[PDB]
Symmetry: C3
Subunit: 307 residues, 3 copies
């Protein structure tokens, strides 16, 4: 059943699906420690097709595949591929799908993963499509939260920053729909969460409050998920200069924060999280990075139908 499934939008997953990925992720995590080399993916090839920059998503996926015993092909720069000669996206996928058993694609255009999944008879995983979705990030974010707070429900989660272009929070907000939590969306009014998404989450009954001042909600938050201003998604630099550096987390802001407050960030960060926060017990973004491998290993194995 998991074999052949795509991972395009977090909205295509139920609470059971997410739960399964996270439980399976823990499985492979421990399993790795024991064997130090798994073989579920022996004879399988993962093609990582990145049309925009990535450090974590590409490297953790390729890392996961090797830990699973598979092989990896792909490109990190579209300029080196034949898209350079003018080839289209659907032609690229139709050709590359014949070389691998699973595709992971990051593209600057929203809906690129859906288009790829449509014309591929190989499972397609969305590593980020424009400012739309980022399903595997959400899945590793939820893994981290459950791992850190031991449990899902009963949490007050705050999403800060560029909620408008941040594909990470678009998916993360949608996934939280299956959990009993109070969501707080803190951001400049120019970078608010897509109305439709905030609408839907309340169309299902979730306490969602949109605010501009962080200190208003800081004190009751269990989770503070910080984001980066997606400079590369703005219409032009002027549109970005108008919201530049207009939020940041540091020791001062953390004065009115609960002792158990945990701060996350999909990364990379520019300056929205002062490095002084790093040494604090609050910071968990680098532990967040770590969980990406077992979560991505679970996804690869599941979708390749090897576990």
């Amino acid at each position: 059943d998991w074999k052949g499934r795509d991972v395009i939008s977090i909205r295509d997953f139920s609470k059971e699906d997410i739960e399964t990925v996270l439980a399976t992720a823990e499985r492979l995590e421990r399993e790795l420690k024991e064997k130090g080399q798994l073989e579920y993916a022996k004879g399988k090839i993962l093609a990582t097709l990145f049309f925009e920059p990535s450090t974590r998503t590409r490297l953790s996926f390729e890392s996961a595949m090797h830990r699973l015993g598979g092989a990896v092909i792909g490109f990190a720069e579209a300029s080196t591929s034949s898209v350079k000669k003018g080839e289209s996206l659907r032609d690229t996928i139709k050709t590359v799908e014949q070389y691998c058993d699973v595709i992971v694609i990051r593209h600057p255009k929203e809906g690129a993963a859906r288009l790829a999944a449509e014309v591929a008879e190989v499972p397609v995983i969305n590593a980020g499509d424009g400012s739309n979705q980022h399903p595997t990030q959400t899945l590793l974010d939820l893994y981290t939260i459950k791992k850190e707070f031991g449990r899902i429900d009963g949490l007050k989660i705050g999403l800060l920053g560029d909620l408008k272009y941040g594909r990470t929070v678009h998916s993360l907000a949608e996934a939280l729909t299956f959990y009993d939590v109070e969501l707080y969306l803190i951001s400049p009014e120019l970078l608010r969460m897509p109305r439709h998404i905030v609408e839907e989450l309340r169309e299902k009954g979730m306490k969602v409050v949109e605010t501009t001042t962080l200190e208003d909600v800081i004190g009751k938050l269990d989770v503070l998920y910080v984001t980066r201003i997606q400079k590369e998604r703005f219409p032009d630099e002027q549109e970005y200069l108008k919201v530049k550096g207009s939020y940041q987390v540091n020791l001062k802001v953390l004065e009115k924060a609960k002792d158990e407050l945990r701060i996350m960030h999909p990364l990379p960060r520019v300056d929205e999280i002062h490095p002084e926060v790093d040494n604090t017990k609050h910071a968990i973004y680098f532990r967040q990075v770590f969980n990406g491998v077992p979560v991505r290993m679970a996804l690869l194995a599941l979708v390749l139908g090897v576990i």
Copy 2:
């Protein structure tokens, strides 16, 4: 011996008496948990005569009586009684005392409880007389302190706010006379503790320092008992506007406070304690409210001669 005793001024109690009430209070507290319904007061009626507003003192006393198995009569508004037709206080008590086995009275005039106790052959408990005394508050405050710090002596207690009109701190300061503690009275010079009381406490040998700046003493305090400015006791509003909002406890003030510092407040609070303090480990005012029932249950049982 306890049967028939009144509870007018905390000065009418020895260290033994206070200790007994607190030990007995713990007894009934645990006992309640077990039986979930006691009967010491079966066939006894408590008359709560409140001539001014109350939430905690009236409700906790009535609550205590029911937990003890007794019945309750009384009025929360004098306007609904025959004092409306012009009846005096002593006539009110002489008549009502024939209907109950114990009276709890809160009146806006100092000495009202003494006058009531004088003309009643039923035990009379002072729930607050003007800006004079508040014995059961002090008794539940001491219960809370011993309960929180495990013990009485060796503490540095700071009383902040309206020490002039605050009947709660007038009694609380007097009771502390039996304990080895350093008292700090922080308040505007217009709202200082009644000279006589501060005099007496030092006439017995207690280190009592009166200051205007809280931060001067904040760092060495074990207990910080905050009070509300008694607006309704001032000569007129102008007299109150001159000391309005001139003290408050929040996270900033708590920067220079000991980790074990515990903050109390007889309540209600207007703005003298910022709600951000609520989530902190320092706040114990709502735990303070809780202890009022077993303390008041102990007092009712003792004075009714049923334990």
Copy 3:
């Protein structure tokens, strides 16, 4: 081998020597607790020759000698000795050395201890020579650090204040040469550590960074060793007025400090460490004073050849 050795410069000790003193110091410490009176120094006399003021170094040494079972002679003020008649230092030592079995000298001129050790056939211990060295302070500082952090290496130590005239940090920096630590020298540019010393420490491979702003390094420090501005060493008061009160440690500065950060100070302190820091878990300067006796007891016993 230890018998007859002098203690002039911390540079005359190897890592083995320092380690031995500290282990031996722990020995005598526990031993004292048991017997409550030792006799290693029975029949031995310590002469404390102080030509400048001292509270800790003189008193802890005399204290140590008595705990060891020895006797003490000496002067705290040179004005009362025959140096008053014009006697020289070498004549003073040559004469006094005939009366005791060990000398402890504090003098305002750099090299005074070396001169004393040269013309004495009795062990000479430098309790401070001008702004040059202070070996027993360093030895008790290292004892405190190992005692507090359980271990030596892997620490980030910050030395703040008057590093120019502070004989305490001149020796302390030199001793740290044998340990794997990152040293941070924070001080006004007018009070920087003697170039030669900072040079040498890096000539051996130690990460040594000299800065003016404390907050730059505060966050990563394990140890913060504060010093006093050596007013009495300045050319004149004007030279001292130019660097007066230009550093201090208080709760504000400690906002960006690690929870395990430990603050030390050889003492006395004027105002460079706000007394509010005292109650904090960071302060250990008075525990630092305590360790001086067993460290000095170890030194006396070792050098007198009685252990």
